[PDB]
Amino acid sequence: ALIERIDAIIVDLPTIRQQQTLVVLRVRCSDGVEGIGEATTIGGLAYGYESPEGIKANIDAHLAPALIGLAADNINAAMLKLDKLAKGNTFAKSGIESALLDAQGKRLGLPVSELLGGRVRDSLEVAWTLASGDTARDIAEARHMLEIRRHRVFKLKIGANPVEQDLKHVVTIKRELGDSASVRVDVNQYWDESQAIRACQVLGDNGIDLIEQPISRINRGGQVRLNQRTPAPIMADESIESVEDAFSLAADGAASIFALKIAKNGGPRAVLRTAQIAEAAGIGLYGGTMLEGSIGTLASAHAFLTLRQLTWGTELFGPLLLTEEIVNEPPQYRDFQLHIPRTPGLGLTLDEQRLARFAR
Amino acid sequence: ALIERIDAIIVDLPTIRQQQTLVVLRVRCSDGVEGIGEATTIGGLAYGYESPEGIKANIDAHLAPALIGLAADNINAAMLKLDKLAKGNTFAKSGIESALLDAQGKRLGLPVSELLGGRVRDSLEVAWTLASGDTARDIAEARHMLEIRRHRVFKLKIGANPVEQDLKHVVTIKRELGDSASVRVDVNQYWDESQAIRACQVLGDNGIDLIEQPISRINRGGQVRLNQRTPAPIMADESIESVEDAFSLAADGAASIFALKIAKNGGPRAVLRTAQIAEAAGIGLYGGTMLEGSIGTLASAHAFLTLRQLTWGTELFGPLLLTEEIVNEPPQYRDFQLHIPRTPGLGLTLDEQRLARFAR
Amino acid sequence: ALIERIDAIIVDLPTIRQQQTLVVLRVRCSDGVEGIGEATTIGGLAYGYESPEGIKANIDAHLAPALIGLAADNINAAMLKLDKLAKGNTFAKSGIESALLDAQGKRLGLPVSELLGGRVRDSLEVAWTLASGDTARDIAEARHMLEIRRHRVFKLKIGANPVEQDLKHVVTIKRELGDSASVRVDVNQYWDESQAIRACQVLGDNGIDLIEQPISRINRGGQVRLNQRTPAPIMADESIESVEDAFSLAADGAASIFALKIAKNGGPRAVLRTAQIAEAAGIGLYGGTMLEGSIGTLASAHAFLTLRQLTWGTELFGPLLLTEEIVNEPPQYRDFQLHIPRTPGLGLTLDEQRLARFAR
Amino acid sequence: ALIERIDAIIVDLPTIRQQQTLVVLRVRCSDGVEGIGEATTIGGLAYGYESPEGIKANIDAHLAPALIGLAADNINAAMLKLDKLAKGNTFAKSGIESALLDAQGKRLGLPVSELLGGRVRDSLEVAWTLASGDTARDIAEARHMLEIRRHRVFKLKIGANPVEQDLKHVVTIKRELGDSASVRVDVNQYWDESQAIRACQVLGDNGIDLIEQPISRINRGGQVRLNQRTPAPIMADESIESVEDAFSLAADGAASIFALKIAKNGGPRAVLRTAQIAEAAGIGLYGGTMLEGSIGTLASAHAFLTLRQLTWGTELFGPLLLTEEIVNEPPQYRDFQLHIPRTPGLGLTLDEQRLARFAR
Ligand SMILES: [Mn+2]
C-alpha cells in the first residue's frame, strides 16, 4: 500500500468553556485504507511554535509532498524522511504519524496500542482541570465530578494572578476536598524562580501533590534547584519540546516527573522514546494533552496503554470540553477513567457531515 | 590439603510465614576436613540475577571443576581464580568462600572470625521484620518481641501499597511503640523519586530511624538528591551488587549507610572489602541478610564480628523464620542479640537426616 | 505614528547557483512612512522550524493583527507584545522588527545603526563560501576573489561526504592558498562527536582557523568537550535558536565563538542582546547570515556596526548570490568589505516592478 | 494467540577456530506458529553472568512457566512480566523476545524489522576479527578478505600480552593495510587506566579508528577521562549491561560510541531503547555481537535495519565462524555486507536433523 493523498483540514469546534481549532489529517492509501490524525494546539502561537494555519501550510507545501508515493506500511522510514527534511514541526509530524498508525492498524486489524508493542491495561486515569476562576464554583464542580465518579484528580492552572491570590485559591480547594481528591497545579512557566521559591513551599506544605512547570524552560539551573528543594515534586512540561530535551532534563536532574505529549515530541512513537528515557532514568510519568479532541486523545491513549507505569495518571479530558466532534464514536469515560477499546487503528471514523459543517 | 569434591544441594525448608530454598555447599578436602556454605536468595529471580537452580547449575558445570585439585588452604588464590573465570555470580561465590573458610577454621582450630583477623565482640544486635500486613497485629508482635527481649529494632517492608496507605501504617506503629523501639522501613526499590520526595519527609518527621533503598538503583542521581534531602538517613542495599558498586556509591555520596550482604558481594572476605571502603569514606554500616538459614547467617555474623562499628545493627534473623534446619546447632538469640561462639569454623555441623529429608 | 498595515510577500529570486525565496515585509504607517523587512531561511524547513509559507501564514493570521493600531515608534512595546502572544517564530519576528526599524529610521532621518546606539565602523569584512564541490575549481574561485580584492576569507561547507574525503578537500585548499587566505569550515551539525574527534584535530593541525558547528546542538556535552580539546576554535551557530540559548551556551562553555544571526534571534535588537551576553562572557563574535538579500543583509549589517569587535568578521555575502534583486540600491562590496551608508533607515527602496515580477 | 510451550536447547557447534555453544529457543503457539530465538554467550561465564547451563535452568524453572498461557501476540506485556519476575537475565530474555518476534512476524507475514517499525536499509556493513595471533598471518587474512570483497573493516582483540607487543602488532597491520581497510581494536577491559593512557595515544596516532572498551566498566571516571583525551574515539561495550547503563554512560559522557548487543540489553526491542538513548545524546552506534549463529545474528540485524545511522558499521560475522549450523538458510554475505531478506519473521527455519545431531 502506498500513500496516495494527505489532506490537512482546519476545524473549529465549539467548547463548553469558546472555540477549539484542530487540524485533522486524512491519509488515503492505495489499498483503499484511510488513516486519520490530529495536530492541535492551544491559542494560536501562545503555547508553541506551530499554529493551525502554519501546520496546514507546512503539511501542504512541504511534508505531504515528501510522502506521496512512499510505502504506507513503513512508518519508521516515512517519519525518518520527515526528520531529514524538516526541523521541529512536531505537531504536524504527530498528526501525520497518528494517521499512518491508524491506517496501519486498520490494515492489519490491530489497535494502534498493539502495533506499538502491546497494551498492559485497557483504561487510563483521567484528571480534570478546574477552570471557573471562582473558588466556590471550583469546589462545587470538583464535588460533582467526584459524585458522578468521573474524576478524582484535579488540576488548577495558576500563575496569572498575584502569587498570594493563587495560593489562597488553591489551598482553599485542597482544604475543602481533603483526602477525597488529588489536587495539582500547573503554573505554565508564569513564575520566575524568585517567586517559585516560597510558592512551592506553601503548596507542598498544604497537600498539593505536584507542581507542573513552575518556571520558564529557559531557566535550567532554576529547575534543577527547585527539583532539589520543593516539598512537592516538580513536573516538566513546556521544558520538553523534543525527545532530545527529555534526555537533557533527565541528565540534569531538572524534574522528577515528565508530562508526555505526542504533539511536543512528534507522535505516538516519539512520545514512547521520551517515556523510555524517563524510565531508564527513574523519572515518573504523566500522560499530557494539548486539548486534543478524540482523535489526538486516542492516539495519545494508545501509546500510554503500553507504558509499564504512569505514577501520576493522565489529563486526557480534551473530548469532554467539546460540544460537537467530528468522529462517530464518543469516548468512554467512567469510573475516573478513559476506556480504550481493542478495535483496529484508533477505533474512530469521521462523521463526514459534522466535518463539512465545522471545517474552514 | 587439596579440594577433592564440592557438592551443591538445593534444600526447601518450611517457614513460619511458606517455603525457603537454600543451596547448601559441601566442600570436602583431601585431609578429611569438610566445609559447609550457603548460597540463598529470595523468590527465585525476583531479588537478584541468581536463582537456586542457576546457582547449582553454574557451580556444577563451571565453578566447582575449576577448584578441584587446588590447595584448600589458599582461599585468596581460589577466589581470585573464580573471579578470572566467572563474571558476577556473587551468591555462588559466597557459598563457596563460606565453605572454604569453614574448612580452614576447623583445620586450624579457629572460628572463622579469627581467620578474618579477630572479633571485637561476641554478639550482634538483631532487628526483626514485622510482616503481618495488619497494623494491630504488627504492634502486638513487636510488643511481644520486646517483652521476651528478643528484638527492639523493627523493620517494615513497604512500597507495594499506595504510598498514603503504607505511610499511615508505619507512622501508626512508631506512634504506638514510641521510644521503646527503633522503627525502620525498607522500600525495596518500589518508589520512583517523585513518590519518595514526600514519603521520606513524612517518615523522617514521624520518628522513622532510616529509609532503606527507597528508589531503584538505576537512579543514581535520585539517590544522591535524597541522600542530601531526606530527614532520615538513606541506606543503600540493592544499589550494591558488588564491591565496586560500593566504591561508586561512596564516591558519589549516594547513601550515608550501606547494608552489608555476603551474597551480594561474594562472600565473607568480599563483604569486608565493601565495609572497609565504607569505613574509609565515613559511611555507616548495617549487617544485612538474604534470609539465609544458620549457615549463611553465621558466615555473615563471623565477618561482622570483626568490624569496628555497625551503627545500625543487623537483621540476622533468618534462622528464626525456619521451622526446620539442616544443622545440629540451633543459633542463640537472647537479649536482643545473636550470640556467636568461639568454636572452629562456622561452629556448625550438618544434620544428615534432615538434609536428606529436605533436599531435592 | 501608528502601524496601519503589514504585508508579507513571498518572492522567488534567481541565484548564481536555482532559486532563493524571501519573505519581504512592508509595514505602512499612519504618517505615510513605510518600512521594509525580510524573513529568509534556507531549504524550506531543512534549516529551521520556519518556512516561507509558514512565516507568511503566521504573520497574516496572528502577528500582523496584534500590531495594527499600535504606535509605530515604540518598537520595544511592539516586539514585547509579539513575545507574549507568540513562542519562537524568530524569523517572522526578525522581519517585522527590521521593517519597524527601517520606518523609524526614515522617520527620524537616522540610519538604523544610529537608532541602535551608534556605529563604530562603516564597513564589514565579508567572507565567501567556496561551494563548487570541485577542489581545483574552489582554489581557482578563491584565487580570483583574492585577485579582484573581493574576499580573502573563505568558508567550506562540509559533512555530507565521507570524512577523509572532506578533510582532503579542505586541507588541499588551505595548502594551495597558504597565508594568503583564512580558510574555515562549517559542518552544519553533520558529524557526531565520534567523527568530530579526529576531524577537528586534523583540520586544526592544517591551518583551518575555526570549525563551525561540527556536531548537533542536541549534544551539549560534546560541544563542551570539543570546545576544550579542538586545536581550532569552535563556533556555535545552529546551537543558538534564541537569546536564551546563547546565555546557556556561554554559561556552559560550549563554544568560544558565537555566530550572530538576526533570523535565529528575532531581529536586529535581539541579535544585540545575544552579542552582549557573548561580550560579558568573553566569547568571540562572527556576523552570520541565512543567505538574505539586501534588506536582510543590511538589517544585519546595521546591527553589526555597533559592536565593539567582531574577531572573526562576517559572511554577509547573500546579495552576491542573487542575479535579480527587489531593491533599487545594490550593495557596495569593495576591498574585502561591505560598505554601509549613513542614509536614513536601512537605506533601501523597493523596486516595485521587479517585486511585482518575482512575487508569487 | 497463546504461548503453549517453550523449549530451551543447548547446542554445541563446530567452529573454524573448538566449539561454540548456543541455547536455541523454540516457542510454540496455540495457532500452530512456532518462533525461534537464540541466547548465546562466549566462554561460559568469562564474558558475562549467564552461561548456557544457567540460561536453560532459569528458562525451564522460572521464565517459561511465567509465559505459558499468555497471549503470544502481546510481546510488550510478556516481556514486562519477565522484568517484574526476573532481575537481569538479559541473555535469556533476548532469546525469548527474539522467538516471540519471529512467531509474530510469521503470523502477520512481516519480517521482524517491519514489526519493529520499518527498515531503512536491506544490508549491513560487516567487520571481521583477525584472530590468528600472528601479525603476518593476520595481514594475509585481511588482504584475502579484501580480495574477495567480504570484509574491509578489521578488528583486533588485544590486551592479553604486554602492551608494547600488542601495540607493535596492531600498528604493523594498519601500516601494511594503509587506506585499504579500517583497523580497530577491542581491549576487552584488559588494561587499567595507567596502561591505557599511553596505549590509546599510540594507537590513535597510527591510524586506528576506534578503541573498544580499553578499561574495565568498574572505572567510570577513567572512561570519562579517556573519552576526553584519547585521540581515537572510545566505544563502550562491556560497560553496557542494561539499557539503564546506557543512559548512565551517556549522561556522564563516558564514551562517544555505544556497541549495541541484543544479549546485553534483553532482546531486539531492548537494544532499540538503548539505541534511542544514544541517538538523543548524539552518541555514535555500532552493531555488536556475542558470536551468535544465524538466529541471533538475524534477530540483531532486523533491529539494526531500523536505525537511522550506524556510523561504525557492525560485526555480525558470527555465522561465518561455524562449520555447521542448525537452520536451513545460510546468511548472505556479499560485497562487505550482510544482506537481509524481506521474508516473514527472522526468515529462518530449523534443520531438525542437524539440531537433533548437535543438541546436547
Ligand atoms: Mn502543562
Ligand SMILES: [Mn+2]
Ligand atoms: Mn533491603
Ligand SMILES: [Mn+2]
Ligand atoms: Mn553555519
Ligand SMILES: [Mn+2]
Ligand atoms: Mn567488545
